[PDB]
């Protein structure tokens, strides 16, 4: 009956309430404690909903639709749930009045169909008009970096961010291809950009002062087995009773390891990397041959080495082929932060890069690293899609405006339903002002003043509270996000309103 429908309304509001403070770059962050007892803090709606694992069917629908928003698009996972859940509150008083939810869901199909048509009209394709090649991507990075602690140092940060995208093919871009390694301690403005891949360098064992940071053309080869002979698991027991035989029964094992020398020595690989920690056995002979070795390397950073110089992983040292080797242009190692950092530079075949970040504390860089990810998506989608729309409240207000005029010509219950859907579009700009500190009541009244003057581009300024146009604020958003957000929010809402009774079997 209608009792379970009302219970599904509050279930969507409870999930929406957690994602309200996380909307926007200046929004608040949520703290969720996983069963693994690991602290996870993120403002992105995808990761938030994936860690909740809610048993409620309607609340899980908002979680499942967030994965579809992150798959086909990857941006707007927080706003798609807030918009989908807002329809549950607007349709709550309509159920008590006798209006069925089926006519409410029917009005959304006609409202979204007319809204998508208005998105293409607001999207203007511009590339070389009033813009250059270098200054195009630089002005987009300063938008997401505004109202942040890095705003003073953002001059040096944009130059390193643009070079990360240009270092890869503009046809295929991925945010996972750009790596970031946090460096505790040091000045923020002293960070540099690296063309190759780097790792954390957790190797604490001795044999330092050699393998200098200056290399010419080192050869890279992947390693599988362990170089050390120490057996961690198995063992053996053999004992003799002869007194004079105690001499040589302590002696010879490592001579068997010499069998793997000539195979590796004739290869000439100057870089030794593996997914297992390198032992304490030989740190020297490699340095005599100008061969470098680094142990305790994570498995995630080993896959980037294969895509860099074109290496390969072989189990033994016998069948290793000579053409699997690769070399970089230059090597660099920095001791800043009381820790050595190994990084490769000048790899022409590298499909990945690494950007180092420095700061006062580790928690300070965590806010800088995540604030950069929002700027990378704006720079990445600029070259991929040439159709962009004005964001920051601009597009969200006009989509709700056109539905008010078109509803006047429509007769029946669909008039108040489209007007309710248009009113439901005001939750997106609301939380953006409340999370940024601005009063949502005063802006909502003042923004609708110039919004009726015939200009559809008026947005909301995120720096200083005021009404105006985001065109001067350099706030750009792609058209694929606004189109897929209305379809994903409506489809997820139609499935919840179409289920009157919830049945859960235990077993």
């Amino acid at each position: 009956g209608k009792g379970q429908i009302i219970s599904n309304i509050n279930a969507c509001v409870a999930v929406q309430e957690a994602l309200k403070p996380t909307l926007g770059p200046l929004g608040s962050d949520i703290l969720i404690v996983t069963s693994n007892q690991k602290t996870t803090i993120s403002n992105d709606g995808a990761t938030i909903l994936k860690l909740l694992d809610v048993v409620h069917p309607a609340a899980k629908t908002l979680v499942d639709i967030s994965r579809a928003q992150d798959a086909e698009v990857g941006d707007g996972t927080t706003s798609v749930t807030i918009l989908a859940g807002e329809l549950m509150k607007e349709a709550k008083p309509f159920l008590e009045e006798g209006i069925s939810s089926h006519l409410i869901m029917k009005g959304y199909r006609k409202a979204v169909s007319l809204a998508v048509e208005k998105i293409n009209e607001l999207a203007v394709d511009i590339t070389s008009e009033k813009s250059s090649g270098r200054e195009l991507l630089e002005r987009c990075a300063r938008t997401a970096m505004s109202s942040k602690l890095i705003h003073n140092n953002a001059d040096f940060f944009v130059k390193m961010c643009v070079d990360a995208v240009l270092s890869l093919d503009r046809n295929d871009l991925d945010d996972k291809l750009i790596g970031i390694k946090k460096i505790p301690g040091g000045a923020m403005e002293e960070s540099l950009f690296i063309n190759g891949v780097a790792f954390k360098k957790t190797f604490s064992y001795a044999g330092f002062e050699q393998q200098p940071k200056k290399f010419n053309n080192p050869k890279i080869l992947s390693l599988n087995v362990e170089l050390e002979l120490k057996a961690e698991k198995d063992n053996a027991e053999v004992r003799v009773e002869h007194v004079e035989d105690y001499q040589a029964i302590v002696d010879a094992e490592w001579q068997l390891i010499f069998e793997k020398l000539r195979q590796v020595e004739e290869t000439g690989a100057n870089i030794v990397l593996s997914k297992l920690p390198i032992g304490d056995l030989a740190t020297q002979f490699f340095a005599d041959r100008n061969i470098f070795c680094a142990g305790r390397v994570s498995a995630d950073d080993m896959n980037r080495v294969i895509q860099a110089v074109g290496g390969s992983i072989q189990s033994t040292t016998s069948d290793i082929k000579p053409e699997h080797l690769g070399t970089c242009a230059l090597f660099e190692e920095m001791q800043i932060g009381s820790e050595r950092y190994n990084l490769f530079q000048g790899c022409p075949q590298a499909k990945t890069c690494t950007l180092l970040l420095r700061g006062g504390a580790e928690q300070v860089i965590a806010e800088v690293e995540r604030s950069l990810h929002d700027a990378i998506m704006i720079v990445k989608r600029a070259l991929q899609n040439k159709l962009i729309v004005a964001g920051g409240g601009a597009t969200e207000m006009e989509v709700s405006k056109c539905l008010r005029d078109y509803s006047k010509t429509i007769a029946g219950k669909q008039q108040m339903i489209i007007n309710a859907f248009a009113k439901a579009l005001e939750v997106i700009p609301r939380q953006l002002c409340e999370n940024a500190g601005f009063d949502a009541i005063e802006i909502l009244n003042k923004l609708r003043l110039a919004h009726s003057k015939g200009e559809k581009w008026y947005g909301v300024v995120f720096e200083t509270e005021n009404i105006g146009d985001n065109f001067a604020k350099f706030v750009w958003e792609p058209a694929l996000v606004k189109i897929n957000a209305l379809n994903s929010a409506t489809e997820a809402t139609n499935l919840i309103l179409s289920v009157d009774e919830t049945i859960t079997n235990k077993g």
């Binding site: 579809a68 029917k106 179409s498 289920v499 859960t504 079997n505 235990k506």
Partner: protein
């Protein structure tokens, strides 16, 4: 006690009232494995739900008759049988025994089934044309995922035409098969990217360096049931470990024996080896040099239907490539379906096969489950297209249920005796079908009902009926006011579905009304 059995079903009666129809509602049922499963078909939901009430099981067993023997009417039998219990409360309150109630339905059943022969105007010629099959398949695919019935109609109509072989003037040998059509689903893509392919699409990885074979026709395919391993002896032949000297013969022995078995197979021209069980590591290295595609089928249910497509036969032994057990396929390629590279299995002209696969694409995982199950229910109605009244049809969507009311009330005063009370209540029980269609569509109950009576009841000075008897229950939500001809959208209920559902609905309510006492134990 007879009221408690009806009240327990009445609480579950409203669940099935929202099933039938495109504007209805669906129920979310959490499976015992921790997976949310939702579907429109009630026969599937009743199997997942655990109900110890035997009175409910009477309607569940009657629902399986609509799911198995027919491809449509699972939601209709639950509405008709549930309404017969509510209208029977008026006769029980007056003091009428259950004998005249059951006898009244039996007398009204023969009167209804006799009039169904006159309800058929047009007859399907069974042309099996792509455009002609869209008339019967559309109403079966409908009432699920409303709005997608236009695109999904071409997928089923084209797949059924591929299953039916070309023949004329022969109705003795059956043609269509239900299990020969398997539907696949992959996350990603859109609905417009779907197509119709003849074969069984394999979503498994190629497992080897050979992605696809050449374009030459009649590729030799070998299906091996025994897994790939070193050749052993059928009698005893147990390999054990004793001394380290035999360890070298175990590794080096498997290299020479497996390479010798694969050489004799490649010499005969076999480009494909199908292994139903696991494949060893050493076997994948030899198949790369001989140019043999690696294909694994872990499901033993697909091996029986594969013999009727390519023509290959499973071999319980290994190393004996008998040419009589080898099949032939024209085209084997590798295409990207849903974003991943998969090996496609299809053909062109020769070796006509009855196995077809409808490829589906979409972002939502739950929406792909209903569309996949709707195709199985859509192709199941093809079996009902045979000689036993497969061409006869009747207008649906509330057109027939209202028209039959005028014929039942005419026979009420004609038949003397106590049966007059059961005949009048027999026609009233059919008013629940058009009422649920108006409630789920948002229309008022006081609107659609009086408009249907005035449309089918007119004063015509003549014997031959005029105007239109095809007026159904309109969803409205568009145009201006009133209803429209249901024949314009080519939506109708097949007579084999409606006529067979009447006999099931009467027997379902007869058992409940005939049981005046129940005895169970606490569980």
């Amino acid at each position: 006690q007879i009221i408690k059995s009806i009240a327990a079903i009445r609480e579950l009666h409203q669940m099935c009232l929202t099933s039938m129809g495109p504007c209805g509602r669906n129920k979310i049922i959490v499976n015992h494995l921790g997976k949310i499963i939702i579907t429109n078909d009630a026969a599937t939901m009743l199997r997942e739900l655990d109900i110890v009430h035997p009175a409910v099981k009477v309607l569940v067993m009657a629902t399986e008759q609509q799911k198995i023997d027919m491809g449509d009417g699972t939601n209709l039998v639950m509405i008709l049988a549930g309404e017969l219990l509510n209208v029977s409360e008026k006769l029980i309150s007056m003091g009428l025994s259950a004998v005249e109630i059951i006898q009244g339905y039996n007398m009204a059943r023969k009167f209804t089934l006799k009039e169904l022969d006159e309800m058929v105007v047009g007859e399907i010629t069974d042309k099996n044309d792509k455009n002609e099959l869209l008339k019967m398949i559309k109403p079966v695919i409908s009432s699920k995922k409303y709005g997608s019935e236009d695109i999904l109609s071409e997928l089923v109509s084209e797949a059924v035409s591929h299953v039916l072989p070309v023949a004329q003037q022969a109705g003795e040998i059956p043609y269509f098969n239900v299990d020969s059509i398997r539907v696949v689903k992959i996350m990603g893509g859109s609905l417009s990217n779907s197509t119709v392919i003849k074969g069984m699409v394999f979503n498994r990885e190629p497992e080897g360096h050979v992605k696809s074979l050449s374009e030459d026709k009649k590729h030799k395919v070998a299906v091996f049931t025994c897994p790939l391993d070193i050749a052993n002896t059928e009698t005893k032949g147990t390999v054990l470990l004793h001394n380290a000297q035999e360890m070298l013969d175990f590794s080096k022995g498997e290299e020479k024996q497996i390479d010798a078995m694969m050489k004799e197979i490649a010499d005969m021209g076999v480009e494909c080896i199908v292994a139903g069980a696991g494949v060893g590591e050493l076997a994948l290295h030899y198949l790369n040099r001989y140019g043999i595609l690696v294909l694994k089928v872990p499901s033993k249910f697909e091996l029986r239907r594969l013999c009727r497509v390519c023509g290959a036969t499973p071999l319980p032994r290994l190393g004996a490539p008998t040419p009589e057990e080898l099949g032939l396929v024209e085209t084997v390629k590798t295409m990207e379906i849903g974003g991943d590279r998969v090996t496609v299995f299809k053909q062109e002209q020769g070796e006509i096969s009855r196995t077809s696969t409808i490829i589906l694409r979409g972002a939502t995982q739950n929406n792909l489950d209903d569309i996949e199950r709707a195709i199985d229910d859509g192709v199941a109605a093809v079996k009902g297209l045979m000689k036993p009244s497969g061409g006869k049809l009747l207008p649906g969507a509330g057109a027939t249920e209202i028209e039959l009311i005028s014929r039942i009330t005419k026979y009420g005063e004609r038949t003397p005796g106590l049966l007059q009370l059961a005949i009048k209540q027999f026609a009233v029980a059919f008013e629940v079908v058009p009422r649920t269609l108006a409630e789920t569509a948002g229309l008022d109950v006081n609107e659609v009902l009086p408009n249907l009576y005035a449309a089918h009841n007119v004063t015509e000075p003549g014997a031959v009926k005029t105007d239109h008897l095809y007026k159904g229950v309109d969803i409205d939500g568009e145009s201006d006011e009133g209803v429209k001809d249901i024949r314009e959208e080519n939506i109708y209920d097949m007579l084999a579905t409606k006529k067979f559902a009447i006999n099931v609905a009467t027997e379902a309510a007869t058992t409940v009304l005939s049981i005046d006492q129940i005895i169970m134990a606490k569980k």
